[model samples]
Target: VKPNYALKFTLAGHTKAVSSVKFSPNGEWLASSSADKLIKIWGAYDGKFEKTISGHKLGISDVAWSSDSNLLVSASDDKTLKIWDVSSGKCLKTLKGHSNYVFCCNFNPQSNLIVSGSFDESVRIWDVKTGKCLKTLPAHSDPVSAVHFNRDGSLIVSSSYDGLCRIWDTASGQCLKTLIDDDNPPVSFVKFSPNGKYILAATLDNTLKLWDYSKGKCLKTYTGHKNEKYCIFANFSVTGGKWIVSGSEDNLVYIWNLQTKEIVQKLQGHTDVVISTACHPTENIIASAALENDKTIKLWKSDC
Candidate 1:
């Protein structure tokens, strides 16, 4: 049976485009970043506005939560990433290394390190406590779009507009595997599945491909979303990894059955390109953000 989700609320606060939204690991807070140069925190369950963190000199591109949910990290077009104390709403440390806009950032499962991709075509790993750039890898020939660590933090995967997703050994800082599509479409986003076995990748060709990175195989491809222009994102549903959800330039959110590769639902609300989405860590909820035409975040809750 297909799951049913209904629009719960339209969260309007950011003056510019909302770039990313993610639920805290503990599932207590929902944090969002935007081109407005602000990061706002809200109650994950009720969507209550909690706090606003402002420090980045330019538009914030992405925001990620620490494993403990006590810290938040944000990547910005200002060419820097800042670690913020979620409780105090204060910027703790500013990490600087990338020469261009920082596009994506994530905290490893241990919360001791951060991985970030930038327009400079480099992926840098940062020591979270020391605020030092630990290692810098010339990740791609074009802008790196996304970077993520596997479940154990032993490996890193990075996607690029250069049309490849490369996996690296976190301990040795070596490229372990390179995944590419036959058509060579520019990859916009990538995420390691919950089990840390498959990679979910969004390409500019309006397709989301599931990749078995170990053997470099395309396991499945999901279509029906418009993603030809913007860097849209897709992720495994946090519930049980039974579904795959993604944002589209078509101004809708698409959910696909993981096993059958069938689109189970298409969430409709945004009037502009839906660029990012986040699933509640433990609940049947989703948060989606859009471009300037919408400039709002919407929450969806499953009707159980």
Candidate 2:
């Protein structure tokens, strides 16, 4: 496999630490949110400046784009979940159900529901149309760091500060399985692969553990990346899942061969801690954001 890491663009606008960068489902648009309490959009393929939205009273924790790329959802420390119209740049709904900071959120595959995790130790499902909380899952004893839906939206996965990755049945709101490490390492994020076959969980112990949910077995663990106690995350390479990608406090984006369990590439560009990394919808471009010290988002494309 040929992977070339070339800088595609250097997006610099956020005044504070940037949290995440997401691409629209079709790969036409890109959006970024920051501790500056602002969200900025960019041309997903061309790197053109789009627009910005500012209203959150506190830092924005996470952002998600709808399937059709018409709507965007964001979770904020201001204790709110907001749905925005991508074209009009106007907020359509303000979901206020959580009593504390909303840390992570994602639109279901149908784009009709929004699932959010919060410092309130709960995961709430919101109906996108009515802006009402559908179901509240009192998930963990500590802050819920990240949450995601499966390919069919039938299951929801959440990670908490208490060091556990819990999977739940979205329909009945039942805890299906609890994936935990023997040492109970503080979990930063957890996610499902494209095929929903395995879960890649990032922990403060500086490891990414892959788990087989059906058998409740720990499959394999990948290490070598410097882990921070903050909200760090990892993902399967978009366009395909041949490799897993993650950011590190070591200031590099690490990609590994899924089957070999070995480092395939380490894309270096960020001067500060690399907080997040994402693959493009269809292309081989990788988008990454750094912490407050860098305040820059770098894009890389593989020539292979």
Candidate 3:
């Protein structure tokens, strides 16, 4: 089915290119990070700017809201991830263990822990309340590009420029699985399915691959993007693992059917490379970040 059009809203607040965007769990607030070194929270439905959080000395790379929506965590190129109180818009804690650019980060499903991936090739786990680094998993040989926690918060998955994706046990700091492809292109993003039974990965090979955790096998590969797919994520808000969305250097966003392993829809509005994408936690809405010419963020809705 084709994606149904929705009321499009343009949020022109950031002065530089927007890097990442995330919708709060309750679908009330939308958080965006930009090269302008600012992170802003906006009303998800009306597109009204709520608060502009400032402190980062460099460009903000990623932003994530807690599962409860009471707090926000952001990563910057300056090698820091700051936690903030969502209501007061005050910085709560600053986590500074990364020695290089912090590219991506996420909060555990329980909201008690935070995980960050950095250019230093390490994944640091932190105590959410104390801002203390609990443990550091240095498994990737190259820069860690993405980090994500599974639905139950029992496990974490990370991807790197080293062309590998790894699964780690959150409590033990042990590597459970190493998805390697020396002959293929590098992996950019890795995310767990809503049920935590599978992983969805995007690679510079210009395809999306699904891996079964229990079986430790690549179950399916979905291909259609003409350029490297930079980001891949599963969408539970739409139909509970029925869809997978990806952003690519082709300046397009793709929606794939989980069961059929096919491209269901393509969103082509960005005039530059699409770097990141996020699906609304409770709505059918999707938001994407573009890298070059079209620096503004774009939103989409699927008919499925």
Candidate 4:
């Protein structure tokens, strides 16, 4: 049987393009970043805006949550990442090193380290407590697109417009594997599977591929979406990674069944490019945002 996904609520507040949306690890809060240079926190289940964070000098590119859900980190076109205390809505620390726009940042599961990818063509690892840059990997020949930490924080995976994704050993600063598709299309986003055994990397070729990173094998490919112009994100559904969900340049959200590699649902509503999506860490829910034309965040629920 197919899972039934339904629209739950629509949230409007950001004045420009919503760049990224994420659910906190603890599953209580939702955080969104925008080209409006603002970050907003909301009740995850209720879709109620609770706090607005403003500190970045330019557009906020991405936002990540600490394991405890009490802290948030934002990457921005201002060339730095800032750590914020969610309760007080205060900027606690600013991490600086990237010479260009910081496109993506992710807090490790341990909440002690942050991995960031930048337009400077580097992937930098930072010490969360000291707010110091620990290691910078000259990761790609082109601008880095996205970076994600493995489940236990032992490894990091980075994608780039250079048409490749690299896996790194977090503690030793070593490159473990380089993943590339046969056609060599630019990769816009990459993430580790919940089990940390597979990689889901989205490419500009209008396809998302599942990879066995250990051996650099492409296991499955999900299609039927236009992703040629933006850094759109496709992710595993939080319900035990049974489904893969993504926003499309076609102004729709697509869901694929993981095991069968079949398009299961196409959620329609957005009137512009749907750029980012986030799945609730433990619930059967998803959140998505689009470009300036829509400027709205939407929540979806699934009956599994």
Candidate 5:
């Protein structure tokens, strides 16, 4: 099946490449990170430019909105993460500790904590309210690519270019599991399922692998894409964990069936590579960022 509908919304202000895009949990706003060193907030439905928050000295690699939808956190090649007030469009705090580029960061569901991964080969836990680094973990040998807090905010999972995924205890910074792939493909993204029972990692091998978080066992692998793989972004459906949506450098978006490990749908509309994708929190909707053709952003809905 194809996307039920597609909305053409142009977030037309970035002078350089848009690196990442995410929707607010309330589905009211879209946050985009760009190589232009600025993060822009836009209307989720209409693509109206809401505000621009700037402070990064280099390319902005990732941007994520807080669970409460009131704050925004961004990571950049300048090796820092900055927290911003969504309402005032003001820079609230600049988090500096990573020695290399800060690649990805996410807020815990509880909203009091943040997890960040950096090219400096470490992950840091921060106290959001105090702007202090609570703990720094030397989890990987190479650059850490992605960091995510589990749905319940009890655990943190991170992936690195060194081909390892480590699970950490949120309160203690203790490493729970070091998932290693013998293939040694660089793990680009790692995230917990919304249900929090499963963890998924995307790799340069052009495959997405699922694991049981509690048992630390590899569960399944979904492979189909043939491209210069960048990453995979997956989120749960509103009803259940029936479908997962992923975007890739293949210039196509895919909906995969968790049970059968099959590609249920392929969404192709972008004239260039589709690098970033996000699923709406409550709706059967998705937003993807494209490269090549004017760098447009497209919104899609599942075909029921």
Candidate 6:
């Protein structure tokens, strides 16, 4: 999503379509998971392929890295979340409680806990030390698409197919606020801003919404990327929250200048529907993945 023509290189490894990709918080690694039931670790600085980790019996639904970047967790259609030791590529624990496929999972700010959403329409919180389910939240009437924790770890935000984004108190396990609109479409994903002041959501209505979760108000609605098929994911650039980037069902990633509320760049490379896009933690590089047999993840740099 830059004039750097950031299509640096296409990483080819997974046998099937990519489901998600996450850059570590410390900016050391890039973790990518795919329908091939594989997770590959790469050196974020040099693009060096490390090792491939596998265990899930089905397609990997999502992947998350701990705040320290020393550990990682993966969600999958196999109904489990596996935590791994990033240093050794070892599976440290496998937590199973969801009756259906687990779609999204996140490690909290302190790295001591994890929260997950499932096709079973529930959200489960787990302790990192014991690998035990601590609480179960009957979150939504429809399947939950994504879940994320705020910067303080005091709150959790979830997106559901019910067309709502619900904010919950992590300590009480109670719904704190519900963000929805009259024209609500199925909410695809929701992520909190790094500073914990805002939330960004993806919807099947072909729109991205920015919200003030604490106020339960929709701050802005962003369009230009078509996400009618997949609940395509989006991210805020590290530009002091000045820019946001998201994948498109239209086979590109749209970078928006939040202040201008205008498209700055439409990064393209994938031949299939672009379903995932992630901005680096400390760099201006973007990583995008797509559907179909287009099983490659492309990296982009904003040299400009």
Report how far off residue 16 is in candidate 1 (Å).
Answer: 0.4
Candidate 6 residue-pair clash tally: 2
List runs of model 4 lying over 4 Å from the truth. Answer: none
> Which lDDT tens digits does candidate 3 get at residues 1-304?
5455343666667888788889998889888888899988888777788889999899988889899999999999999999999888799999989999999999999999999999999999999989999999986989887899998898999998788889999999999988764354778788888888888877877777888976777888888875454443334335434677777777777777777877877787887777777887766778877774677777666544
Query: What lDDT score belongs to each candidate, Candidate 1 first?
Result: 0.92, 0.88, 0.82, 0.93, 0.81, 0.87
TM-score of each: 0.98, 0.97, 0.93, 0.98, 0.93, 0.97
lDDT tens digits by residue: candidate 6, 151-226 = 9899999999998899999999999998877777899999998889999998888888888877888888788878
Residues 220-286, candidate 5, lDDT per residue (tens digit)? 8887864345554555444334776677777787778876778877777776677788877776667
| Candidates 2 and 5, the one with greater TM-score | 2
TM-score: which is higher, 2 or 4?
4
- State the displacement of the C-alpha of residue 154, model 1, in Å, after optimal TM-score superposition: 0.4
What total of clashing residue pairs does each candidate reach? 0, 0, 0, 0, 0, 2
Off-target runs (Cα >4 Å) in candidate 5 are 1-10, 227-229, 239-241, 292-294
RMSD of each: 1.0, 1.2, 2.0, 1.0, 2.0, 1.5
Residue 195 in model 3: shift from native, Å? 0.6
Pairs clashing within candidate 3: none
TM match of model 4 to true structure:
0.98
Q: Which residue window of length 10 is worst by lDDT in model 1?
A: 232-241
lDDT of 2 by residue, 224-256 (tens): 889966778688885644778889998899988
